[PDB]
Amino acid sequence: AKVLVLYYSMYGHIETMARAVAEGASKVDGAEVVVKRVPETMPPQLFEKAGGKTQTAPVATPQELADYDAIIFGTPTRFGNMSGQMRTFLDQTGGLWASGALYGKLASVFSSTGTGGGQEQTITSTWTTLAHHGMVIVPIGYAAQELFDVSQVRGGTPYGATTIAGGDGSRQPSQEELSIARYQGEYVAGLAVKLNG
Amino acid sequence: AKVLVLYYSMYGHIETMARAVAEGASKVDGAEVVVKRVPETMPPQLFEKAGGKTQTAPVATPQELADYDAIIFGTPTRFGNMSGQMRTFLDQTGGLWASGALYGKLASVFSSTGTGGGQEQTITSTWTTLAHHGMVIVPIGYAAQELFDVSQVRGGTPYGATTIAGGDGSRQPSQEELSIARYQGEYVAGLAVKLNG
Amino acid sequence: AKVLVLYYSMYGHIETMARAVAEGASKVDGAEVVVKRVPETMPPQLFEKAGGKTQTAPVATPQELADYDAIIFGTPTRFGNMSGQMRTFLDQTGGLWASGALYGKLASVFSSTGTGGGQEQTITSTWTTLAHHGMVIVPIGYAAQELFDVSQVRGGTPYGATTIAGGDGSRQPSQEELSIARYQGEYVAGLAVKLNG
Amino acid sequence: AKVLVLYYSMYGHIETMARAVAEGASKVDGAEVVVKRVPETMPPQLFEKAGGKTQTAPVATPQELADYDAIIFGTPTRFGNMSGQMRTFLDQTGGLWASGALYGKLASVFSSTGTGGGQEQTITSTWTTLAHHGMVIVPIGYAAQELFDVSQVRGGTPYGATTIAGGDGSRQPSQEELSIARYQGEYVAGLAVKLNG
Ligand SMILES: Cc1cc2nc3c(=O)[nH]c(=O)nc-3n(C[C@H](O)[C@H](O)[C@H](O)COP(=O)(O)O)c2cc1C
Numbered sequence A, B, C, D: 001a002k003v004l005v006l007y008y009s010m011y012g013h014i015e016t017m018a019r020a021v022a023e024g025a026s027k028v029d030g031a032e033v034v035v036k037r038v039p040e041t042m043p044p045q046l047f048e049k050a051g052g053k054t055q056t057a058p059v060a061t062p063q064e065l066a067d068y069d070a071i072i073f074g075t076p077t078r079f080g081n082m083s084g085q086m087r088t089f090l091d092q093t094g095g096l097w098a099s100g101a102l103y104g105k106l107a108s109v110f111s112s113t114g115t116g117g118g119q120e121q122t123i124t125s126t127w128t129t130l131a132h133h134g135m136v137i138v139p140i141g142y143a144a145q146e147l148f149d150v151s152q153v154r155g156g157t158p159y160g161a162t163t164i165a166g167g168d169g170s171r172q173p174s175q176e177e178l179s180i181a182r183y184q185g186e187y188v189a190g191l192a193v194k195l196n197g
């Protein structure tokens, strides 16, 4: 089964999560795992001035999403929705929609926020779009034990992995957050192989 | 694979839809299909005096949900949520949650409304609960061609089948609506057999 | 203006929050503030055996909601929805709906969860029902400074105040959580007086 | 009071609805109504070649939103979310967010879809973003009697006005749909004047 980890990141938090998701998915033998980012929509000069992070991941095309058995989408929140960059990219999948190209493929979502608020809404609003394409939606539930720990500030929900970046973006994804992300990658890839071989 | 069509219906619109879902599911070789309703929560006298419909489907226990590979949940809307009956029943699945009993099982949802409003929100808000149980959520997308037909008033969404009961409850599920319902059962039962034999 | 704080609580977390909300609302001169609970739906013997908390607040009727200019709803989560008790109560407001009795009245929501997951979904899914009644929906945004603090585990979202009860229910609402709850009460009551005098 | 009808439209269906919203709002004595569109994000050549409609409304800046007492947002759906154009624009309101510039301002939403699916989710997912800004969210409920009419295919929800463009975009907003749109503008403008003079 082929598993695409497709993400948008400005300051690297989602990028770090995406690598963890891919690390989990890769544990599944017979899962072929690929990490790509959506295009930046900001002018390059404004991106740089804002202190955005340069990223090694190849830039995806909308069309190539059809090549995968499972797609795990990562996006930071923008006021409780996916980012404009991820939205713009998904708005370019009308050809895929019309051909039923993503129908029955697995979909799962992970997110990042500054201070936690909107992390659930970002994931479930993204599920809406996945459903229009007839993708099978994969939440993570409470298999990841870290979800029971309320001793430290941490992202992660039953809807999908998340990270808390801090108001000023200075936090890095924690061990527990990354664990949950790895689990989500393992679980989705396992399902993809179960379904598609 | 074993498929439970689990529903609440007061006036029979969801009951009718549930039978169509079960019909569709039973078309799949290897699928064992069972239809049950959740308990009424209204006092029986008030149920009858409001004109509630007597139903032949047996009443489910929370515990028996563990026995199935796929559960297709049907509920009328109550102001854009699942009904109190369905909510009260799902509130009794804490034991199943604690044991991971529904984890990884397929889930899908169908709804009914008087005049359309809330039919999407009923489905997607039900998905939230399914996700807490770690169920794999199955939307129907646009595979059912009736979804393209805007020439007549018609339930059905990419999130799941729906029916429009009319303001006074006098409408009966239409052929197009029942077709989408059958498609949903068949599709989900197919996935269930693919995953579980 | 008359402000109803209407809540459901099994173990007292929402009850504690509700009192804080009422404490905030009462700071607004010319706001008349009342706290009531929805009926328990569990058999009394099962409630007691589960270690449920007895509560002094009077039990509301559905009809009396019409008497208020603003209603602030509190409910614990059940898998990312409002509780069956709150759902059952709201399912009894069909008379109010048909008469437009809650139309244009202010609505706001607060929630409680064991470990955080579902706290956003509980609030926004509740908003759906409020919208069917034509209630004006009042989120709190980020006026409450505590929402910026990620140094300690704490509830509170831009959608409404929340508390984290812990997996075993042993946590009590924190100073920061209660502050946010008080703010929500103050803010809603201020709006109610602005609108209705 | 000042009312901004802020919209995105590619083929004019939301543009038509926006004009009706503005018509309704202008009926309120004391309401100053302004209609503006968000910037196109598609390359101009691709916009034209796809048959995009030239529009007379001026393009808004993020900054000018601060000048209004009520903002009524219109967007077509993109797979059950707001359009990338509207998302990209709202993503540029971080400055306004940081200063509390939209806090306590009225907000309301209207949508358009090809065949109905996603019209509710578009509205409610837009509400999420409004809530992060602390805006007071205004659904329309069932005040508009057309919402009771299931005899013809018709947009409109208790969450806000909608229109059905048809699979091929050839439908024009109907009289019933435009009536609901006008009602929404009038209602929101009335609240704006009540609160702000
Ligand atoms: C336009 C905008 C909107 C934002 N909205 C929220 C929000 O609603 N809640 C939150 O906690 N953080 C919010 N943030 C913070 C971002 O989610 C955060 O910077 C992002 O998760 C960092 O991930 P990245 O490093 O992968 O880009 C917002 C930031 C921007 C620029």
Ligand SMILES: Cc1cc2nc3c(=O)[nH]c(=O)nc-3n(C[C@H](O)[C@H](O)[C@H](O)COP(=O)(O)O)c2cc1C
Pocket: B008, B009, B010, B011, B012, B013, B014, B015, B076, B077, B078, B079, B080, B112, B113, B114, B115, B116, B117, B118, B165, B169, C090, C091, C092, C093, C094, C132
């Ligand atoms: C409490 C209550 C709330 C309702 N809310 C809505 C609603 O938001 N939208 C709608 O179209 N119909 C609404 N209705 C209509 C029911 O959804 C409708 O009667 C039901 O779908 C019929 O299905 P059934 O025959 O399976 O019971 C409501 C009915 C009741 C009793």
Ligand SMILES: Cc1cc2nc3c(=O)[nH]c(=O)nc-3n(C[C@H](O)[C@H](O)[C@H](O)COP(=O)(O)O)c2cc1C
Pocket: B090, B091, B092, B093, B094, B132, C008, C009, C010, C011, C012, C013, C014, C015, C076, C077, C078, C079, C080, C112, C113, C114, C115, C116, C117, C118, C165, C169
């Ligand atoms: C049926 C059931 C479902 C629950 N679902 C969740 C959940 O999804 N997320 C969560 O963090 N806690 C969940 N809990 C915990 C409750 O939300 C928690 O006990 C409640 O917030 C306590 O508030 P109270 O003291 O006011 O009753 C659930 C508890 C029960 C009994």
Ligand SMILES: Cc1cc2nc3c(=O)[nH]c(=O)nc-3n(C[C@H](O)[C@H](O)[C@H](O)COP(=O)(O)O)c2cc1C
Pocket: A090, A091, A092, A093, A094, A132, D008, D009, D010, D011, D012, D013, D014, D015, D076, D077, D078, D079, D080, D112, D113, D114, D115, D116, D117, D118, D165, D169
């Ligand atoms: C990328 C894309 C996604 C779309 N998704 C949906 C959809 O989920 N449901 C639907 O009914 N129409 C969908 N459509 C149709 C648009 O919502 C429709 O063309 C729009 O409402 C027309 O409004 P406008 O004339 O103001 O641009 C989609 C169109 C595009 C281009």
